[PDB]
């Protein structure tokens, strides 16, 4: 416990230095060769690229400034980059470079070829309780780290959990990550993973991450999320109801933990009590977990993604290659001046 406290203090000092003096403009597009588009969204894309000089592969997130403004994701994109450049933890994907041009914002990250947990979960069906516990433990440590720096993550789901070549998690997408002391109000996340207090719209705190952990653990072990319905409105009804139905194969301990994580009133929810993360870390379901060994990656992973070489992308879906448009005129200069 003393080694944790001492680790987190050093980590806060490290974070705050970089938080106060953010790295900017540490590379340029011309330094990278495009290999393949790994994914697309409403205001950007992520591409596999090769750094021309070193031959190292990276995952490059490219965001269209005009589209970020239109979808009102300005502050969110600024948060993402500022937080990512300042954090350092094994289970967070490392931001190696960032920069911008006339048209786009760029975040070059370590490439994780194993793909998203979500795809592996669908292929396998459901994880064993020992299997789920392995992943969950890493998320518990990751939140313990993030919350210690007053950071809420807010985008937990298996889609955002990449599996590295050691079979350990790397969390990607900090679009909803925010530094806040106390409460915040933005309606954001994924309907299946939203805490009641987000839906209720009265404001909320880091306790929403612990709720989402409850959802993640359920989804991992059951093969499907605890609150599912045809339409978001019906999903939200189930969430705020205070009712969960657990599969028969769920251990008594697992159910107890999920009852305490999927706790509707944020003042009785595990991880938001006076005793914080220890209520989770010391829970019976985790009695077998060696938290230090997990941090170190000394625990045998349940599954190692097949490596198929550098620049192989078989763990990702296919996407048509579209142009990377760079305008001659600077766009949205003011809005993204801090990037």
Curated annotation (Swiss-Prot):
User: Start and end of every AGC-kinase C-terminal domain?
Assistant: 287-339
Q: Kindly list the positions annotated as binding ATP.
A: 38-46, 61, 110-116, 157-160
Its keywords, alphabetically, are: ATP-binding, cAMP, Cell membrane, Cell projection, Cilium, Cushing syndrome, Cytoplasm, Cytoplasmic vesicle, Disease variant, Flagellum, Kinase, Lipoprotein, Membrane, Mitochondrion, Myristate, Nucleotide-binding, Nucleus, Phosphoprotein, Serine/threonine-protein kinase, Transferase
Domain Protein kinase: residue ranges: 32-286
Q: Can you state which reaction this protein catalyses?
A: L-seryl-[protein] + ATP = O-phospho-L-seryl-[protein] + ADP + H(+); L-threonyl-[protein] + ATP = O-phospho-L-threonyl-[protein] + ADP + H(+)
GO terms for cellular component: acrosomal vesicle; calcium channel complex; cAMP-dependent protein kinase complex; centrosome; ciliary base; cytoplasm; cytosol; extracellular exosome
Instruction: Quote the annotated effect of residue 36 to R.
Output: Enhanced basal kinase activity
User: How does the record describe the protein's post-translational processing?
Assistant: Autophosphorylated. Phosphorylation is enhanced by vitamin K(2). Phosphorylated on threonine and serine residues. Phosphorylation on Thr-186 is required for full activity. Phosphorylated at Tyr-319 by activated receptor tyrosine kinases EGFR and PDGFR; this increases catalytic efficiency.
Q: Which residues carry this modification: Phosphothreonine?
A: 37, 184, 186
Q: Name one GO molecular function term.
A: protein serine/threonine kinase activity
Query: Where expressed (tissues)?
Result: Isoform 1 is ubiquitous. Isoform 2 is sperm-specific and is enriched in pachytene spermatocytes but is not detected in round spermatids.
**Where can this protein be found?**
Cytoplasm; Cell membrane; Membrane; Nucleus
Show the disulfide pairing: none
* Result, substituting residue 194 to R: In PPNAD4; somatic mutation; the mutation results in cAMP-independent basal protein kinase activity and constitutive activation of protein kinase A
Active-site residue list: 155
PROSITE patterns hit by this protein: AGC_KINASE_CTER, PROTEIN_KINASE_ATP, PROTEIN_KINASE_DOM, PROTEIN_KINASE_ST
Q: What class of enzyme is it?
A: transferase
What does this gene product do?
Phosphorylates a large number of substrates in the cytoplasm and the nucleus. Phosphorylates CDC25B, ABL1, NFKB1, CLDN3, PSMC5/RPT6, PJA2, RYR2, RORA, SOX9 and VASP. Regulates the abundance of compartmentalized pools of its regulatory subunits through phosphorylation of PJA2 which binds and ubiquitinates these subunits, leading to their subsequent proteolysis. RORA is activated by phosphorylation. Required for glucose-mediated adipogenic differentiation increase and osteogenic differentiation inhibition from osteoblasts. Involved in chondrogenesis by mediating phosphorylation of SOX9.
Q: Which PANTHER family does the record associate with it?
A: CAMP-DEPENDENT PROTEIN KINASE CATALYTIC SUBUNIT ALPHA, CYCLIC NUCLEOTIDE-DEPENDENT PROTEIN KINASE
Its protein name is cAMP-dependent protein kinase catalytic subunit alpha
């Amino acid at each position: 416990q003393e080694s944790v406290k001492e680790f987190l203090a050093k980590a806060k000092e490290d974070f705050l230095k970089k938080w106060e003096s953010p790295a900017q403009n540490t590379a340029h597009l011309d330094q990278f060769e495009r290999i393949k588009t790994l994914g697309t969204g409403s205001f950007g894309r992520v591409m596999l690229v090769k750094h021309k000089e070193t031959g190292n592969h990276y995952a490059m997130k490219i965001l269209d400034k005009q589209k970020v403004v239109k979808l009102k994701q300005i502050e969110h994109t600024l948060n993402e980059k500022r937080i990512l450049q300042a954090v350092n933890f094994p289970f967070l994907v490392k931001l190696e470079f960032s920069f911008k041009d006339n048209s786009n914002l760029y975040m070059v990250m370590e490439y994780v070829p194993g793909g998203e947990m979500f795809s592996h979960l669908r292929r396998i069906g459901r994880f064993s309780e020992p299997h789920a516990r392995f992943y969950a433990a890493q998320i518990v440590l990751t939140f313990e780290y993030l919350h210690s720096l007053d950071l809420i993550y807010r985008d937990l789901k298996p889609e955002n959990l990449l599996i590295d070549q050691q079979g350990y998690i790397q969390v990607t997408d900090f679009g909803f990550a925010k530094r806040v002391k106390g409460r915040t109000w933005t309606l954001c996340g994924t309907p299946e993973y939203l805490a009641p207090e987000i839906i209720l719209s009265k404001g909320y705190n880091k306790a929403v991450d612990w709720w989402a952990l409850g959802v993640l653990i359920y989804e991992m072990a059951a093969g499907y999320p605890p609150f599912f319905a045809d339409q978001p409105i019906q999903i939200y009804e189930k969430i705020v109801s205070g009712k969960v139905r657990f599969p028969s194969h769920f251990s008594s301990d697992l159910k107890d933990l999920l009852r305490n994580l999927l706790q509707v009133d944020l003042t009785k929810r595990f991880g938001n009590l006076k005793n914080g993360v220890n209520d989770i870390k010391n829970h019976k379901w985790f009695a077998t977990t060696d938290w230090i060994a997990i941090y170190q990656r000394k625990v045998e992973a349940p599954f190692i993604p097949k490596f198929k070489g550098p620049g192989d992308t078989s763990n990702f879906d296919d996407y048509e290659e579209e142009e990377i448009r760079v305008s001659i005129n600077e766009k949205c200069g003011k809005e993204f001046s801090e990037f």
